Design a protein around this ligand. Structure first.
Ligand SMILES: Cc1ccccc1S(N)(=O)=O
Ligand SMILES: Cc1ccccc1S(N)(=O)=O
Ligand SMILES: Cc1ccccc1S(N)(=O)=O
Ligand SMILES: Cc1ccccc1S(N)(=O)=O
Ligand SMILES: O=C(O)CNC(=O)C(=O)O
Ligand code: NI
Ligand SMILES: [Zn+2]
Length: 331
């Protein structure tokens, strides 16, 4: 078996290899990339997402989210407090202010140390889940707004036509902005392009070991666990690499820089943080191998987890028994 230690693999496709998205994902998996839960793809030197990022300051962040932590330095939850709208230009200025700017540091490792030591004592503001794209319409390869849809994949594989659409989302981050431990909706893949700015550090648990992380989370967040059988779907829980090591949870880490893609694989739990002002674009996607994961995906039915409209059809077709209880939850 390829990649038995479940290491994060890094790929450097040629421009010829970059022409067929589906084929390249399949190639990565033939090399065992999915076993890690996460892969990095560095695009060919000839490729570009767009010409420049010069005129993005007028994008609106309608609902910036202040990420307020509770708990201990290595085991905490965060909740999102809504703030007044601001443009990307205003947000960038805020990110760079004395209150919010990245502190002096020696290297990525030093910054990582500072993040886990001090994250809980600050409340950075994140511009997350903004529908839109920064890919030039003329960028034909790996354009996250031009991927085959999950609905079309499910139709190709299962012969059923369903309603729904899926489109990309933009994320504007600053120092300490955090993504909590989670897998994707329906345990889909995700792909994430860092368009500009400072890096993003990722942590990931191999899909074959996801239940180990779930068991630890139930122990560390006992009230949350009693409230919901799939509370990680709420996307609020953080556990540090030190705490993971102390509890024998297998995981890896890698830092993504501007101009690089990351792919998360079905049922690959991931979490992370931004180093400073940045902008990423991400979208979910599927392949034939996803279908079996979609059929088995846990669901939140306590009401907390947000459902896109399109998730309805996925649950209805792949999980008809659960459909009753789940739909009562989102209503
Ligand atoms: C950038 C480039 C240039 C020539 C052929 C193909 C490409 S690609 N696949 O878009 O990266
Ligand atoms: C609020 C909090 C804080 C730290 C650990 C666990 C929790 S929770 N959501 O009560 O399980
Ligand atoms: C538990 C821990 C904590 C920090 C560094 C290393 C470890 S260990 N003994 O390698 O799992
Ligand atoms: C023990 C160790 C050390 C470094 C990175 C990851 C691990 S773990 N918890 O074995 O995956
Ligand atoms: O970038 C972020 O804040 C979170 N991104 C993801 O979880 C993803 O791309 O799957
Ligand atoms: Ni994700
Ligand atoms: Zn729930």
């Amino acid at each position: 078996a390829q990649n038995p230690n479940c290491n994060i693999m890094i790929f450097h496709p040629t421009k010829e290899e970059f022409n067929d998205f589906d084929k390249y994902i399949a190639y990565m998996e033939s090399q065992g990339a999915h076993r890690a839960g996460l892969a990095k793809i560095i695009p060919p030197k000839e490729w570009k997402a767009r010409e420049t990022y010069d005129n993005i300051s007028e994008i609106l962040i309608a609902t910036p989210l202040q990420q307020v932590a509770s708990g201990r330095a290595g085991v905490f939850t965060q909740y999102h407090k809504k703030k007044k709208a601001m443009t990307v230009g205003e947000y960038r200025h805020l990110a760079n202010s004395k209150k919010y700017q990245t502190p002096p540091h020696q290297n990525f490792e030093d910054l990582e140390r500072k993040y886990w030591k001090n994250r809980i004592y600050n409340s950075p503001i994140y511009g997350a889940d903004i529908s839109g794209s920064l890919f030039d319409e003329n960028t034909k390869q790996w354009n996250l707004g031009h991927l085959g849809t999950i609905q079309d994949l499910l139709e190709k594989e299962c012969g059923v036509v369903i309603e729904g659409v899926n489109t990309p989302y933009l994320y504007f981050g600053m120092w300490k902005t955090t993504f909590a431990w989670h897998t994707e909706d329906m345990d889909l893949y995700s792909i994430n392009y860092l368009h500009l700015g400072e890096p993003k550090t990722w942590y990931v648990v191999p899909p074959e070991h996801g239940q180990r992380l779930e068991r630890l989370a139930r122990e560390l967040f006992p009230g949350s666990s009693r409230g919901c059988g799939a509370f990680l779907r709420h996307k609020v829980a953080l556990i540090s690499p030190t705490v993971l090591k102390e509890n024998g949870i297998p995981f890896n880490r890698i830092t993504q820089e501007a101009g690089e893609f990351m792919v998360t694989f079905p049922y690959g739990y991931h979490a992370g943080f931004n180093h400073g002002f940045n902008c990423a674009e991400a979208i979910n996607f599927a392949t034939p191998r996803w279908i079996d994961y979609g059929k088995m995906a846990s669901q939140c039915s306590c009401g907390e987890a947000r459902v896109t409209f399109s998730m309805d059809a996925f649950v209805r077709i792949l999980q008809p028994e659960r459909y009753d209880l789940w739909k009562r939850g989102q209503d």
